[PDB]
């Protein structure tokens, strides 16, 4: 038609796009908080609904760290999404984006609730990683580092497939930046720290940017309250010692080296887990390919200088390259053949990272690159995870509409025949 309901539930929000367009195609029309209010009846049976009854009803957050911690709350949340749909704008195909942590149990329950309760005829359960994959055509091997608030997912993909046994997460994310900043500024409150993290002047500096000027990175930042320069009732930020940012209460606050600190721990942990993860990819060439295509997404990653720092840490830790001391020894030894006055003029030059043949090793990676995004993204927001997931989901949609000969989704007929286990005959 295409009237497709695409739902993408996350820990803290949920993106919903009703219908497909393909001309003036659109970003998610609806973004709602992932939550549902829940009351209890006389016998302990739960009544789920959209809004709290006065002050009395229990707020439930069905998704934590991308996982479904309460499946019933979640299903009811879907029901309320369809209510919230028909109320503004009746049989529509549902395309639900899934998370790697969701069990088979979870998925089967989702299927049974989608058919026997929501009474819709067509279901598609599409892994987020595979949607994101399909968004970028002809990209076969890659690794998704997705940094959330409380957790970071690492999702390696080989031959268009998610490697479930290598997929893991670490209990660190945006909030850990807040924690380490709090350790660096024990006097500030949490809102000022949060405002600092979201401020324009908050950026991770390159080792170039660190070495050039200022301060000296290796302590406590200051044992003093937040410096309030102003309040109410243009040169490189890297080069200034002190800089300014604004609070949510309308406070102009000065800040020092702390605006350059807070992400080291997170990126180091991430780099470790990534290292082990890709180290356990069985085929060497597939692993090489994966290393050449690194995807860094997540809200936290929109912080200025973050992605470059994570890539930098990946190279620092994991890149296979001749030790600088050895290479310099070979360079000097090779230069011994030159006349002493050519050697003389070669000494204080900026080295060409040259002359003699590089040492080739029998391991990967010798190359670590972020995967380059294709031309057709513009624009907001920072061409993130949401955008590519929805693009991929749209691609899948078109792919199954234009192929009537194939049925590559769950149908009411097939659900009637095999039950919820009909889900497993249609896998990406």
């Amino acid at each position: 038609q295409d009237s497709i309901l695409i739902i993408y539930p996350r820990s803290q929000t949920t993106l919903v796009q009703f219908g497909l367009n393909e001309e003036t195609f659109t970003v998610p029309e609806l973004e709602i908080p992932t939550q549902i209010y829940r009351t209890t009846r006389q016998d302990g049976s739960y009544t789920y609904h959209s809004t709290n009854k006065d002050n009395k009803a229990e707020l439930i957050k069905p998704i934590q760290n991308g996982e479904i911690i309460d499946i019933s709350a979640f299903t009811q949340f879907l029901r309320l999404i369809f209510v919230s749909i028909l109320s503004d704008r009746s049989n529509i195909p549902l395309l639900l984006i899934t998370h790697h942590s969701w069990s088979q149990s979870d998925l089967e329950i989702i299927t049974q609730y989608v058919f026997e309760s929501l009474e819709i005829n067509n279901l598609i359960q599409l892994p987020a990683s595979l949607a994101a994959t399909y968004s970028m055509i002809s990209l076969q091997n890659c690794c998704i580092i997705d940094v959330g608030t409380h957790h970071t997912d690492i999702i390696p993909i080989v031959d268009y497939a998610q490697l479930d046994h290598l997929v893991s997460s670490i209990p660190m994310g945006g909030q850990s930046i807040n924690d380490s900043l709090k350790k660096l500024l024990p006097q500030w409150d949490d809102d000022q720290i949060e405002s600092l993290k979201k401020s324009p002047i908050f950026e991770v500096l390159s080792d170039d940017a660190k070495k050039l000027s200022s301060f000296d990175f290796g302590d406590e930042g200051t044992l003093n309250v937040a410096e309030i320069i102003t309040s109410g009732r243009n040169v490189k930020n890297s080069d200034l010692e002190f800089n300014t940012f604004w609070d949510e209460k309308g406070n102009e606050i000065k800040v020092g080296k702390q605006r350059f600190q807070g992400c080291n721990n997170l990126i180091k942990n991430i780099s470790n887990r990534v290292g082990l993860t890709l180290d356990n990819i069985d085929d060497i060439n597939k692993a090489k390919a994966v290393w050449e295509n690194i995807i860094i997404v997540g809200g936290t990653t929109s912080i200025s200088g973050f992605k470059e720092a994570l890539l930098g840490q990946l190279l620092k830790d994991h890149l296979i390259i001749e030790p600088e001391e050895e290479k310099s020894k070979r360079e000097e030894e090779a230069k011994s053949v030159l006349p002493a006055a050519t050697k003389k003029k070669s000494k204080f030059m900026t080295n060409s990272t040259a002359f003699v043949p590089t040492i080739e090793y029998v391991q990967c990676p010798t190359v670590i690159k972020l995967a380059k995004y294709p031309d057709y993204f513009p624009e907001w927001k920072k061409s993130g995870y949401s955008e590519i997931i929805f693009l991929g989901a749209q691609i899948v949609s078109k792919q199954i509409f234009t192929h009537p000969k194939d049925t590559f989704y769950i149908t009411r007929e097939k659900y009637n025949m095999k039950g919820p286990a009909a889900l497993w005959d249609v896998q990406f």
């Binding site: 069990s103 479930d164 046994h165 180290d279 060497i284 390259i321 090793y361 029998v362 391991q363 286990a421």
Partner: protein
Amino acid sequence: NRKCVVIHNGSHRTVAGFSNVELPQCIIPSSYIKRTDEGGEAEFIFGTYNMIDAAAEKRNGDEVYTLVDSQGLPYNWDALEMQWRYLYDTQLKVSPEELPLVITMPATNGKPDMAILERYYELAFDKLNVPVFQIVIEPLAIALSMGKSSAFVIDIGASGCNVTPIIDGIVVKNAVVRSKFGGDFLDFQVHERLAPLIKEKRSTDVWYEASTWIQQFKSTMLQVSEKDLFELERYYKEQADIYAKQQTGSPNNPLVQKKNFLFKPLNKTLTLDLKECYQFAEYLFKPQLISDKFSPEDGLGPLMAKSVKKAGASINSMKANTSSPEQVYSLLLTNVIITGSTSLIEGMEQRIIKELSIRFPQYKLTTFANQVMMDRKIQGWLGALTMANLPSWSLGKWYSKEDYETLKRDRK
């Protein structure tokens, strides 16, 4: 009926997941870390990650133990219960009592241990209380999944080389041969030979090394020579000599080519020449070169030939059914399934082919080795998954004149 839980406990790997997906849900180390805490509780730590993070913590209370002995059987059953509960609760995320369970036992020459079967029944039924439970023989499942009723399965793992001939779908028990020289052996030899180049609590560290740089060295630097390494040294030396003689590396002598490995812990280059890489794997074929218990007959070649001839002679205990020993040979040698992680080293299959052909000339050798590496590492689990999805076909029993005759005697 809908899906099985499939679990394979190897001497190195544990593979787990539902039978309705081709790729396993988990592949973890069979080894685990036991941590006696300062909290007062005993904690179990499974998984390459987690175990590595813990080994990084360098806590004194941490000890790494094995779950499966060199025979492929479980020797620590409380820990095995803990691992199974880990897989069920935190990974597969399903109650054990909900679905059936399919596991793996290695092929054994003697009649199966009813001790460890009682242990399996006690674990599965009494503790985890799974509703239905089945055990499959690993190389047999592997043969069945490839549709080879007659198969010669050479499985080179971490424990050693397990050779299991199969004819008409029966394991042919007395022909089963297990070697002592596998990937663990190679781990040790790599550590020993590379020790001088590195030099100039503990168990978690030994593990950590075995699971990081040693593993990478094996998967990158180790190769098997297509023929006997000494003979090849002689051959390449002489060929190198005769081709420059018509009067800065040499193309006619591959054995002196420098190959470089980056040793991450010290961040220094380890350089070996191709011969020195060949040596490691060469120890598998000529074990006598390292030490003596080891007879040359403990090498892969003699063991393989031994298994073949043993299966041949043994098949006549069936009265031979034809009008045959050489025929069963041809049959085994024409269906050779090379599997196991260690079998992924660069020259393994060609060297196995050579070793088999020199000991069985005037025979047709046909070997099959999965070119998909991840698959070759988990082939047994894949086979188990295949058998798990089989229908419950009630196939008519065969019935011997003797099977009727002994009953006819028990009546009288």
